[PDB]
Amino acid sequence: FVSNSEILKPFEKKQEEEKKQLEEIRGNPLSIGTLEEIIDDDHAIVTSPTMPDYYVSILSFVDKELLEPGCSVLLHHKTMSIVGVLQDDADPMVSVMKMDKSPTESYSDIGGLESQIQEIKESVELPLTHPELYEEMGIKPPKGVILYGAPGTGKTLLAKAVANQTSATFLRIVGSELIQKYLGDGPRLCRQIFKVAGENAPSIVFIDEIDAIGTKRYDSNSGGEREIQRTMLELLNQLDGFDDRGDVKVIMATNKIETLDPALIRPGRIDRKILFENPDLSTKKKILGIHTSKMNLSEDVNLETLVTTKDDLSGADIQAMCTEAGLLALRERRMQVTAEDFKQAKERVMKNKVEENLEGLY
Amino acid sequence: KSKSSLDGKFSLFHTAVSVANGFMHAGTTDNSFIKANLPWLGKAQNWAKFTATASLGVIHKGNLLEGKKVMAPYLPGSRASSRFIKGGSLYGLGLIYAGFGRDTTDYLKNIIVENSGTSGDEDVDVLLHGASLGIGLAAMGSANIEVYEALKEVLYNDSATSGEAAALGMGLCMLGTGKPEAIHDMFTYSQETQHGNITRGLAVGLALINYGRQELADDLITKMLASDESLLRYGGAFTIALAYAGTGNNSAVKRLLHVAVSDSNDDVRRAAVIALGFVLLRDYTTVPRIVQLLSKSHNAHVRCGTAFALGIACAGKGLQSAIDVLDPLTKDPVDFVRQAAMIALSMILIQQTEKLNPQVADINKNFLSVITNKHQEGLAKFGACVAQGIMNAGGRNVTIQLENADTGTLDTKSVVGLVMFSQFWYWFPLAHFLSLSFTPTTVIGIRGSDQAIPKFQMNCYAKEDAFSYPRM
Amino acid sequence: KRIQSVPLVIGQFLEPIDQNTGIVSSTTGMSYVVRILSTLDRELLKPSMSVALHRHSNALVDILPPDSDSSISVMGENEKPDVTYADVGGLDMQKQEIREAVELPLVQADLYEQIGIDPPRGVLLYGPPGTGKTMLVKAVANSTKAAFIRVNGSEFVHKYLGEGPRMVRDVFRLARENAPSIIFIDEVDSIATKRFDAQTGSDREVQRILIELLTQMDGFDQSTNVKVIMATNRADTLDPALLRPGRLDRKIEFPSL
Amino acid sequence: LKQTENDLKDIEARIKEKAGVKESDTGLAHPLQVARCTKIIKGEDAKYVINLKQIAKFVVGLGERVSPTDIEEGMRVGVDRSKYNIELPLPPRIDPSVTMMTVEEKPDVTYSDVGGCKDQIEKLREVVELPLLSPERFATLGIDPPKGILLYGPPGTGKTLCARAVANRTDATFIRVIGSELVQKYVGEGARMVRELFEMARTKKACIIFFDEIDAVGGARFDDGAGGDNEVQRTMLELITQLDGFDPRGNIKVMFATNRPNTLDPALLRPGRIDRKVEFSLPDLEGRANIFRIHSKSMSVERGIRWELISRLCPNSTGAELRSVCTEAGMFAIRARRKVATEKDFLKAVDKVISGYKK
Amino acid sequence: QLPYLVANVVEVVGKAAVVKTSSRQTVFLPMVGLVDPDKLKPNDL
Amino acid sequence: NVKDLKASQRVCLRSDSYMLHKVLENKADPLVSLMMVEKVPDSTYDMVGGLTKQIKEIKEVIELPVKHPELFESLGIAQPKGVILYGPPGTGKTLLARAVAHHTDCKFIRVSGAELVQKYIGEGSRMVRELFVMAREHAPSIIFMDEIDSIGSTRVEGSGGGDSEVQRTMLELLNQLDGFETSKNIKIIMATNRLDILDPALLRPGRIDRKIEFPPPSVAARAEILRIHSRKMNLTRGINLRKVAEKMNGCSGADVKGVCTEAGMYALRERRIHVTQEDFELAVGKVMNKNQET
Amino acid sequence: TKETVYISSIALLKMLKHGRAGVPMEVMGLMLGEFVDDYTVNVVDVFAMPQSGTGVSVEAVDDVFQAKMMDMLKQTGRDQMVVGWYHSHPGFGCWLSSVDVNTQKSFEQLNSRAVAVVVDPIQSVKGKVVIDAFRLIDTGALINNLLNKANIQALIHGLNRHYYSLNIDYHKTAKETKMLMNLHYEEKEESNLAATKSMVKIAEQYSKRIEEEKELTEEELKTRPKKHLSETADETLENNIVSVLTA
């Protein structure tokens, strides 16, 4: 505090003189650009982001061993020579990426999905904490899981939850959106996903909804589109190129597996098939139990009464029920939520979802 | 404090601090800048090195015995360190001995007649230059047709360097009522020969011979204004200024107002507002009303010339209202208007400074701020640096007068001196003529009888203004 | 004046940032932040303009009126009609129907005001074109001294997501400035057929146009200084949304007997 | 010690280099695939600049210009990736990766997932193995062994393995080329790679070029008019030309693999380039039991059980699935709370993977 | 001076041709004795 | 300084000297490309009174969080962040949406879906990204999503892949907001009356938290909607509005607006400023025929 | 550093005319005049050299052409030295090419000193003229007007680059100037012709000024505009008055 300042000011000053002397030699101002390729005759061809290419000589701040293809770099204006190195965190390297490093969601917050919880735990969490069971027996681990169901309630929740538990970077890419309408650019985009992963592990790679670029057809003539299949293949070949015991676990989302290649399953990688169901009585009890904690409510309301009229529903319906119920209580201007309020709300959403109907009792 | 803040902003920056040295140390004898920086001399250009030698001319002014003596190792027949020094030596000597140059003049005349025959090398031109400047100062105020004649042949070589000197030298000597001859011969010759430096030098040359003339000078005034050359019209103002110097005349001032407004040429406007002040020296109450309008102009040349105009006329007395005008002009957007306001302000308020007027502390502070800043331009810092020298001239004791309060009558040295002073970027070693009109404020015992130096207080009640002077 | 002179580049004004700053888009594909006119201010100046810029002194020289014509995404303009009603005989009934629907709100604002109604923004014509039906439409355009704006409704049918749906808004805007005007829609039933199923690209566009007209009609309070005439030959390939009244009130039949 | 050494080196080098580049840039300015020199102007001639880019086509054609070293200046004397005449001063088409495929001479695999592949394996023996073993017998007969083979069916599940197994047996270099890499986004970059792959095949001859994917580099499509796949078309044509043109096809075998058998381009299809069309053969009951023994040698399991038993419950499964049973029996084994796998973990592990698979 | 920009031709009155340069600009230019109007077409250098 | 330069700051760069000559403001540019902003609308929902039952429901679902967050907060509920309205088409649906917006004093932001998901590489991408920046900043604001609808007023009959691909894109943003930001009182209004080709995950809480059913109109309601609108109209005295309404069958809110403009057209044709009951009956019968078409 | 390079009227006129037709292919020629001491470069005449269809170069200068024009010039009585060179170069006016630096370095050693005059004809139609004058190297004001002597100290140590942006002025002679202004039968015809044609047209102009006033007056009312009304009243008034005055 006082101790830092006394030292700090004379210490700062020597640094600045040196720092000024550095600054003069290297110049300013500069264009930022990207390395096209790195050449060991101390040259470089560079891709300038204004477009053109210039075969340039390195100015020594770094060597070509302290440089990698596709690093971001400081360029002058002379012919665009390499003045200095810069980080790639800032300059784009993404497709569609939500990064959520250690997400808010957790198993505790989405109630009892307990049976589903147990599967995802042995495949995704267990290798990262404990390579050792896999190593001792001498078996390979699942490095992928597939989550089937609908998102927000099944697929999304389990995948957010688990990442938070393992303290890994959750990356959601939307598969379809790459579904770009020009030949050739899906394959670039797949490359950037895998590039970021290897740089920034541990990670969970979530590919949402691979069924627009996930196609694999039977043709490429007669209304066949060649890009769609190309992208699907680039994606597959990198995936099979990556293998880990606890650097990357891959979570997929999709709802058809017969649009996917049997080598994108790759039996001996994706062992696990985790699927959402509608929960049990006990787990439903837990989902209710958490959500009522947060309410102020009557004591005529029970978890038990609410269970019996339920026919097995998703956790999302239970959440939806709570928001609808409070809204009739707030409309009656009061903060007590009766057994009748939650019951009116439940009936109503169930009714809106169950638009198709079929007599099953006969 | 000043010198050491930067060495940037061209060789002009050196010219300024050389000039501020000489003013501060005037007649006190004090070489401090030169002792320290001899590398500084290596920085400096040819023309800055000529000012630096000559600045010693102001320092050793006062001693008329060791004034020559100091300059002795820098004479020819004894050589110098540099030919650029060597030239400034003969200009510094002429400063010291002016109006009593009698011997040295005959001496200096021979160098002149000598290098008209040949000496087109640039080192010999600058030698021939110094001799010509120095001798016009030295024979000033006293007719010598031998001086007129000599110098006219330096002109016939048409040196851009020497011609300037020679030309002033002919005006300076033949001060008075001129001759019909000098007027027609110079004026014709100005159209005939071509140079810019020559045109500026011969115009000011022609004006100078006309002092106290009035209507007899009216003929050359008409001819110059009738020339459509900028140089001659620049010179044309001064001719009126000088001819009518002292006596307030409405006709004379009117002629300068007409040239000043309507001509396209920017340079002429500046010279002409400067020229107003000298006629109007004795009607100094009228100047704050005239230049209230003209400090608000779209041409910067007008604003610079007016800081100087107001300054010259109102120098010998107060005028607080006057100081209020120059205020905006200090911070005026253009760099050369800032320069000129700073210089102007310092010539009036020498020992009226130092919190007599509350504002003058903010102005003095500002002079400091500019120098210390290096985001201020060469002319702005030039302006701060020489203005510092004028205020602090001869150790804060000696003063800038015109329409004196220490002698009480008009002085030839003074009017002429400021006219050289108005040009200092137009040709660089012209500053030193400010030397000629530093006046002592001295309050000393006195004897009606022959001197022996009594010193005693006369104890009468008085304000604070040896207690309010600028500060350490 | 002498500096601010033709030839100039045309660019488009986005917004004025403050006074003597505006952001402009040059039609080079380079955008600049520039100063703006001191002839205009912020009360004389609208944010969206076509503007005149200096070529090398890149600044707001002049303002133009909005413009929409280009050789991408074409629109048909037909200025100075030359057709006057009862071209074909036996359109006695129909001559009167159109007259009170289309012609009347433009020429007389005042009758709608006093009854206390607001003028219908749409008319639907069903029948074959070019029997007598088109001829009447063109005749109203003449009599009102209105620009005839011919829109082929399948022309955006452009295969891009982008330019055409944007244009249609701009066309109607350009029509309101140069009021009165007729937006005459060839086969609006073409683009009253829309996706219901996965079809991906190359069927997506008809949805965009349909929605564009709908947003405008229902989204804004009634006025008529610009009339929309829909022309239809398949009457079942419509969608109910169009046909809903309070906006589209007039259903004029072309007679076939 | 180290910190000071690095910085001095970098300042010292940089000042010399900065002086040299600026000198070479005077005029107005070894991979180059497009080469501006930014209006170095003279003139006949003295601009001598090759741009290969669609925008700006610079042709210095009509045969010879005899030069010691030179087109023109600007750090960039060269003649891009595709040559508008200009017979090759200074190294422009040496580019660091124009190869990246994986070669395995005398493969590791000889038997891995190769059980119950009998029909497939016998075909490879007659086609590949025997002309390599005796080139003289095929010459005397009058026949050619198949110039090209095309292999279809589940790919890499046993396919790549089977190929490696025959190759090892004859001591024949196995060259595995990834279809997808041949998809570089630069000019010719693509024609560069194909060419050097076939040059390598002729040097190392008595060798198999295994192309996984051939729809990565493309076959027939309607999407050539759909405005992008120009880069693709360059690669495809180059490939055909090299193969049929001057590759000897007696010992050098080329094997193609395809994902859609119906998407071949007509050039590809026709006899003289593809002769033999081989089916993938699924491991049979006996075969699956053997593969079960091979893969459990790593695992730590009881040897008193029989593999056979697991196989009866197993229905028709590719080599990949067998492997998936093996890692899953161990996960089961930890779950059931023992450090050996019983028969019973193998049975459960089958039940789980084969239902899950749903193909 | 080698090189030259190529062009395709979209107008072949008596001395005029319009050429479309590989710089996406159309110009109105006159023809000379070193061109024939028979070698002014699309698919020629 | 750099200490007044922040993220998403707009700046002005010299095009010969490439240095920051001045600084503008932070914000992203608005672009009119069908995605536009329209600040404070002018509509009122008691034009269409006798829609009262929806009025209580709307007031509480949308308005109440914005005006008083605290009630919802103190109870402990994840208060509404999206609305779906479902049920009878063509009631002058958009007018409602604006009317509520005027009351809560927010931007009505009408977004065209499909031009977020383009034939040009990413460009579409540009507009998704600008939209989200604006709407956090200018928050609270109401987004009406054009092109998803089945509601007779912006109908387009859903889509399997042209506005299901776009909703996926929307769905990432809504997910990101529930996370670290935890932003509510930022609203999306969807309305559609088909969901047998639209995705359910939108209707799950997180995005759409409340699903409210539109009421069917009645004879008693049609009479109210008519009573308000005719009030501006000059009428012939002795008229009975309940009678005219009863003669309606099925008629939604927009149809009632048609009855007054047609009643008036009939009067206009006869050069009358007053309209009898009889013209009004004849007008309703015409309006009924309009609903029967297609 | 600082030099007033004095451009003759005729030199200027011929340079702008030539340079505007000559682009986009570069054009050059030679400047004639005299050095007078230092501080002063007078340019007296300028003549064109040939064009080359891909731009003029150091390789394209031809000493026989420049020579044959001067020798023929001499027998009028035009006796000048070469003081430099002009070039068109679009997008040059504060910058120089590396080719153009090298080109200047050869030229100034032949002369005493030399200017590279680069004229830009693009912004010569925008209500301004762009021309600059350069000279890097030489002694003439790099020692009279030029840390301290910073340009020429670094210059001589090499591995440096600075343009040498000069000062420029104009004037030829008074007589030419009176003649140029006498370009503007003449003034009388012109004035009568305008007079008649004003009286015909006053019929439209009357009505149109009534609208301008009417628009202005309406604006003011809402507001209370006044500034627009003043401008707009002055313009109409002055222009009546001239129409009346003629008759």
Coordinates of N, CA, C and O in Angstrom, one line a residue, chain A residues 25-26 39 45 52 54-55 57-61 78-79 122 133-134 137-139 142 182-184 188 191 216 220-222 224-226 229-230 232-234 237 257-258 260 262 267 271-273, chain D residues 10-11 13-14 17-18 21-22 29-33 36 75-76 96 180 183 185 213 215-216 218 220-223 226-227 229 260 263 299-300 320 324 327 330-331 334-335 352 356-359:
Chain A
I25 N 11.8 1.8 -32.1 CA 12.4 0.9 -33.1 C 11.3 0.2 -33.8 O 11.3 0.1 -35.0
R26 N 10.3 -0.3 -33.1 CA 9.2 -1.1 -33.7 C 8.2 -0.4 -34.5 O 7.5 -0.9 -35.3
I39 N 6.9 -19.3 -43.2 CA 8.0 -19.8 -43.9 C 9.3 -19.7 -43.2 O 9.6 -18.7 -42.6
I45 N 4.3 -15.4 -46.1 CA 3.2 -14.9 -46.9 C 2.2 -14.6 -45.9 O 2.1 -15.4 -44.9
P52 N -5.1 -8.3 -49.9 CA -4.2 -8.9 -50.8 C -3.0 -9.5 -50.1 O -2.8 -9.3 -48.9
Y54 N 1.1 -10.5 -49.8 CA 2.4 -9.9 -49.9 C 3.4 -10.8 -49.2 O 3.2 -11.3 -48.1
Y55 N 4.5 -11.1 -50.0 CA 5.5 -12.0 -49.5 C 6.5 -11.1 -48.8 O 7.2 -10.2 -49.4
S57 N 9.2 -10.2 -45.1 CA 10.2 -10.7 -44.4 C 9.7 -10.4 -43.0 O 9.1 -9.4 -42.7
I58 N 10.1 -11.3 -42.0 CA 9.8 -11.2 -40.6 C 10.7 -10.0 -40.0 O 11.9 -10.0 -40.2
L59 N 10.2 -9.1 -39.1 CA 11.1 -8.3 -38.3 C 11.2 -8.9 -37.0 O 10.2 -9.2 -36.4
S60 N 12.4 -9.3 -36.5 CA 12.8 -10.1 -35.4 C 12.2 -9.5 -34.1 O 12.7 -8.5 -33.6
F61 N 11.1 -10.2 -33.6 CA 10.7 -10.0 -32.3 C 10.4 -11.4 -31.8 O 10.6 -11.7 -30.6
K78 N 4.8 -1.2 -44.9 CA 5.8 -1.1 -45.8 C 5.6 -2.1 -46.9 O 5.8 -1.7 -48.1
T79 N 5.2 -3.3 -46.6 CA 4.8 -4.3 -47.6 C 3.9 -5.3 -46.8 O 3.4 -6.3 -47.3
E122 N -21.5 -41.0 -15.4 CA -20.5 -42.1 -15.6 C -19.7 -41.9 -16.9 O -18.7 -42.6 -17.2
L133 N -10.3 -45.7 -13.5 CA -11.0 -46.9 -13.7 C -10.8 -47.5 -15.1 O -10.7 -48.6 -15.2
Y134 N -10.9 -46.6 -16.1 CA -10.7 -46.9 -17.5 C -9.3 -47.4 -17.8 O -9.2 -48.3 -18.6
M137 N -8.6 -51.3 -15.9 CA -9.2 -52.4 -16.6 C -8.5 -52.6 -17.9 O -8.2 -53.7 -18.3
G138 N -8.4 -51.3 -18.6 CA -7.8 -51.1 -19.8 C -8.9 -51.2 -20.9 O -9.0 -52.2 -21.6
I139 N -9.7 -50.2 -20.8 CA -10.8 -50.0 -21.8 C -10.7 -48.6 -22.2 O -10.0 -47.8 -21.5
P142 N -16.2 -43.9 -23.2 CA -17.0 -42.9 -24.0 C -16.4 -41.5 -24.0 O -16.3 -40.9 -23.0
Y182 N -24.1 -21.4 -49.4 CA -23.2 -21.3 -50.6 C -22.3 -22.5 -50.4 O -21.8 -22.8 -49.3
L183 N -22.0 -23.3 -51.5 CA -21.0 -24.3 -51.7 C -19.7 -23.9 -51.0 O -19.1 -22.9 -51.4
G184 N -19.2 -24.8 -50.2 CA -17.8 -24.6 -49.7 C -17.6 -24.1 -48.3 O -16.5 -24.3 -47.8
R188 N -15.0 -24.8 -43.7 CA -14.2 -23.9 -43.1 C -14.6 -23.8 -41.7 O -13.7 -23.7 -40.8
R191 N -13.8 -26.5 -39.4 CA -12.5 -26.4 -39.0 C -12.2 -25.5 -37.9 O -11.7 -25.9 -36.9
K216 N -27.0 -36.8 -45.4 CA -26.0 -37.6 -46.0 C -26.5 -38.3 -47.2 O -25.9 -39.0 -48.1
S220 N -26.5 -37.1 -55.1 CA -26.0 -35.7 -55.3 C -26.4 -35.2 -56.6 O -26.2 -34.0 -56.9
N221 N -27.0 -36.1 -57.4 CA -27.7 -35.7 -58.7 C -29.3 -35.6 -58.3 O -29.7 -35.9 -57.2
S222 N -30.1 -35.0 -59.1 CA -31.5 -35.0 -59.1 C -32.0 -34.3 -57.9 O -32.7 -34.8 -57.0
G224 N -30.0 -33.1 -55.6 CA -29.0 -33.5 -54.6 C -28.2 -32.3 -54.4 O -27.8 -31.7 -55.4
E225 N -27.7 -32.0 -53.1 CA -27.0 -30.7 -53.0 C -25.7 -31.3 -52.3 O -25.8 -32.2 -51.5
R226 N -24.6 -30.8 -52.8 CA -23.3 -31.4 -52.7 C -22.6 -30.8 -51.5 O -21.9 -31.5 -50.8
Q229 N -23.5 -32.5 -48.0 CA -22.8 -33.7 -47.7 C -21.4 -33.4 -47.5 O -20.8 -34.0 -46.6
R230 N -20.7 -32.4 -48.2 CA -19.4 -32.2 -47.9 C -19.2 -31.8 -46.4 O -18.2 -32.2 -45.8
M232 N -20.9 -32.3 -43.7 CA -21.2 -33.5 -42.8 C -19.9 -34.3 -42.8 O -19.5 -34.8 -41.7
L233 N -19.3 -34.6 -43.9 CA -18.0 -35.3 -44.0 C -16.9 -34.6 -43.3 O -16.0 -35.2 -42.6
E234 N -16.7 -33.2 -43.4 CA -15.5 -32.6 -42.7 C -15.6 -32.6 -41.2 O -14.5 -32.8 -40.5
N237 N -14.7 -36.1 -40.0 CA -13.3 -36.6 -40.1 C -12.4 -36.0 -39.0 O -11.5 -36.8 -38.5
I257 N -31.0 -40.5 -36.1 CA -29.7 -41.1 -36.1 C -29.4 -41.8 -37.4 O -28.3 -42.2 -37.7
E258 N -30.5 -41.9 -38.3 CA -30.4 -42.5 -39.6 C -30.3 -41.6 -40.7 O -30.5 -41.9 -41.9
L260 N -27.6 -39.8 -39.9 CA -26.2 -39.7 -39.6 C -25.5 -40.9 -40.0 O -26.1 -42.0 -40.1
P262 N -22.8 -43.9 -39.9 CA -22.5 -44.9 -38.9 C -21.0 -44.7 -38.4 O -20.5 -45.3 -37.5
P267 N -18.8 -46.5 -33.4 CA -18.9 -47.5 -32.2 C -17.6 -47.8 -31.6 O -16.7 -48.4 -32.2
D271 N -20.5 -44.7 -27.1 CA -21.1 -45.8 -26.4 C -22.4 -45.6 -25.8 O -23.2 -46.5 -25.7
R272 N -22.5 -44.4 -25.3 CA -23.6 -43.9 -24.4 C -24.7 -43.4 -25.2 O -24.4 -42.6 -26.1
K273 N -25.9 -43.8 -24.9 CA -27.1 -43.2 -25.5 C -28.0 -42.7 -24.5 O -28.8 -43.5 -24.0
Chain D
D10 N 16.9 -9.6 -31.0 CA 15.8 -9.2 -31.8 C 16.0 -7.7 -32.2 O 15.8 -7.3 -33.4
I11 N 16.5 -6.7 -31.4 CA 16.8 -5.4 -31.9 C 17.8 -5.4 -33.0 O 17.6 -4.7 -34.0
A13 N 19.0 -7.7 -35.1 CA 18.5 -8.4 -36.4 C 17.6 -7.6 -37.2 O 17.7 -7.5 -38.4
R14 N 16.7 -6.9 -36.4 CA 15.6 -6.2 -36.9 C 15.9 -5.0 -37.6 O 15.4 -4.7 -38.7
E17 N 17.5 -6.0 -41.0 CA 16.4 -6.6 -41.9 C 15.6 -5.5 -42.4 O 15.2 -5.5 -43.5
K18 N 15.3 -4.5 -41.5 CA 14.4 -3.4 -41.8 C 15.0 -2.5 -42.9 O 14.3 -2.0 -43.8
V21 N 14.7 -5.1 -46.4 CA 13.4 -5.2 -47.0 C 13.1 -3.9 -47.7 O 12.7 -4.0 -48.8
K22 N 13.4 -2.7 -47.0 CA 13.0 -1.4 -47.5 C 13.7 -1.1 -48.9 O 13.0 -0.6 -49.8
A29 N 6.5 -2.6 -54.2 CA 6.3 -4.0 -54.1 C 4.9 -4.5 -53.6 O 4.8 -5.1 -52.6
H30 N 9.6 -20.5 -52.1 CA 9.0 -19.1 -51.9 C 7.5 -19.2 -52.2 O 7.2 -19.2 -53.4
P31 N 6.6 -19.4 -51.3 CA 5.2 -19.3 -51.7 C 4.7 -18.0 -52.3 O 4.7 -17.0 -51.6
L32 N 4.2 -18.1 -53.5 CA 3.3 -17.0 -54.0 C 2.3 -17.7 -54.9 O 2.6 -18.6 -55.6
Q33 N 1.0 -17.4 -54.7 CA -0.1 -17.9 -55.4 C -0.9 -16.9 -56.1 O -1.9 -17.1 -56.7
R36 N 1.3 -9.4 -56.8 CA 1.4 -8.0 -57.1 C 2.8 -7.4 -57.0 O 3.6 -7.8 -56.2
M75 N 10.1 -8.3 -54.2 CA 10.1 -9.5 -53.4 C 9.4 -10.8 -54.0 O 9.3 -11.8 -53.3
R76 N 9.0 -10.7 -55.3 CA 8.0 -11.6 -55.8 C 8.1 -12.0 -57.2 O 7.1 -12.2 -57.9
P96 N 4.6 -25.2 -48.1 CA 5.3 -26.1 -47.1 C 4.7 -27.4 -47.0 O 5.3 -28.4 -47.0
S180 N -10.8 -35.5 -47.8 CA -11.1 -34.2 -47.3 C -9.9 -33.2 -47.3 O -10.0 -32.0 -47.6
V183 N -9.3 -30.9 -49.5 CA -10.1 -29.8 -49.9 C -9.5 -28.5 -49.4 O -10.0 -27.8 -48.4
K185 N -8.8 -24.5 -49.9 CA -9.4 -23.3 -50.3 C -8.6 -22.3 -51.1 O -8.6 -21.1 -50.8
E213 N -12.9 -41.6 -49.2 CA -13.7 -40.5 -49.8 C -13.2 -40.3 -51.1 O -12.0 -40.3 -51.3
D215 N -15.9 -38.4 -52.7 CA -17.1 -37.5 -52.9 C -16.8 -36.2 -52.1 O -17.4 -35.2 -52.3
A216 N -15.7 -36.3 -51.2 CA -15.0 -35.2 -50.6 C -14.3 -34.4 -51.7 O -14.4 -33.2 -51.7
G218 N -15.2 -34.9 -54.8 CA -16.4 -34.8 -55.7 C -16.4 -35.8 -56.8 O -15.3 -36.2 -57.3
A220 N -20.0 -36.8 -59.7 CA -21.2 -36.2 -60.3 C -22.0 -35.3 -59.5 O -22.4 -35.8 -58.4
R221 N -22.4 -34.2 -60.0 CA -23.3 -33.3 -59.4 C -23.9 -32.2 -60.3 O -23.3 -32.0 -61.3
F222 N -25.0 -31.6 -59.9 CA -25.9 -30.6 -60.5 C -25.5 -29.2 -60.0 O -26.3 -28.3 -60.2
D223 N -24.4 -29.2 -59.3 CA -24.1 -28.0 -58.4 C -22.8 -27.3 -58.8 O -22.3 -26.5 -58.1
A226 N -24.1 -24.0 -59.7 CA -24.6 -23.4 -58.5 C -23.6 -22.6 -57.8 O -23.7 -22.1 -56.7
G227 N -22.5 -22.3 -58.5 CA -21.6 -21.1 -58.3 C -20.5 -21.1 -57.3 O -20.2 -20.0 -56.7
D229 N -18.1 -24.4 -56.7 CA -17.4 -25.7 -56.7 C -16.5 -25.9 -57.8 O -16.4 -27.0 -58.4
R260 N -21.6 -43.2 -51.5 CA -22.8 -43.3 -52.3 C -22.4 -44.0 -53.6 O -21.5 -43.5 -54.1
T263 N -22.9 -42.1 -57.3 CA -22.6 -40.6 -57.5 C -21.2 -40.5 -58.2 O -20.6 -39.4 -58.2
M299 N -7.7 -56.0 -22.1 CA -8.5 -56.0 -20.9 C -8.1 -57.0 -19.9 O -7.3 -57.9 -20.1
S300 N -8.5 -56.9 -18.6 CA -8.1 -57.7 -17.5 C -9.3 -58.7 -17.1 O -10.0 -58.4 -16.0
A320 N -16.5 -52.5 -35.8 CA -16.5 -51.4 -34.9 C -17.3 -51.8 -33.7 O -17.0 -51.3 -32.6
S324 N -16.7 -51.9 -29.5 CA -17.6 -51.2 -28.6 C -18.2 -52.2 -27.5 O -18.4 -51.7 -26.4
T327 N -15.2 -52.4 -24.9 CA -15.0 -51.3 -23.9 C -16.1 -51.3 -22.9 O -15.9 -51.0 -21.7
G330 N -16.1 -53.8 -19.6 CA -15.3 -53.3 -18.6 C -16.0 -52.2 -17.7 O -15.8 -52.1 -16.5
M331 N -16.9 -51.3 -18.4 CA -17.7 -50.3 -17.6 C -18.7 -50.9 -16.7 O -19.1 -50.3 -15.7
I334 N -16.9 -52.7 -13.6 CA -16.8 -51.7 -12.4 C -18.1 -51.5 -11.8 O -18.2 -51.4 -10.5
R335 N -19.2 -51.4 -12.5 CA -20.6 -51.2 -12.1 C -21.1 -52.3 -11.3 O -21.8 -52.1 -10.2
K352 N -26.8 -53.6 -24.6 CA -26.7 -52.2 -24.5 C -26.3 -51.6 -25.8 O -27.0 -50.7 -26.3
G356 N -28.8 -49.6 -28.7 CA -28.5 -48.2 -28.8 C -28.2 -47.7 -30.2 O -28.5 -46.6 -30.5
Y357 N -27.7 -48.6 -31.0 CA -27.1 -48.3 -32.3 C -28.2 -47.8 -33.3 O -28.0 -46.8 -33.9
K358 N -29.4 -48.5 -33.3 CA -30.6 -48.3 -34.1 C -30.3 -47.9 -35.6 O -30.6 -46.8 -36.0
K359 N -29.6 -48.8 -36.4 CA -29.4 -48.6 -37.8 C -30.0 -49.8 -38.4 O -30.0 -50.9 -37.8

